[PDB]
Amino acid sequence: GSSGSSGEGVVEAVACFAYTGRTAQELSFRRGDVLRLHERASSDWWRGEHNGMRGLIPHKYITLPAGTEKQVVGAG
Numbered sequence: 001g002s003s004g005s006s007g008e009g010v011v012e013a014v015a016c017f018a019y020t021g022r023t024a025q026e027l028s029f030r031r032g033d034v035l036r037l038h039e040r041a042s043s044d045w046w047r048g049e050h051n052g053m054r055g056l057i058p059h060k061y062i063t064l065p066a067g068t069e070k071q072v073v074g075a076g
Contacts, residue, residue, distance in 0.1 A: 027055035
């Protein structure tokens with residue numbers, strides 16, 4: 001298995017802490033505010049769209065749901 005479909009994907013992450021986008025590119029949200037992670041943006045950043053807003057998302061201020069992206073073969 002592990003085929004995956006590169007087309008329609010969305011990961012819901014929770015804001016571990018209140019963040020404030022420095023520029024239009026970055027986004028803002030208060031701890032607890034969920035954000036849709038369109039697709040990886042950088043080593044420590046992502047791409048999502050807030051309420052009427054669109055920009056990047058901090059991977060440090062956000063905690064991915066059970067099953068983070070590791071892509072590391074192995075089981076048991």
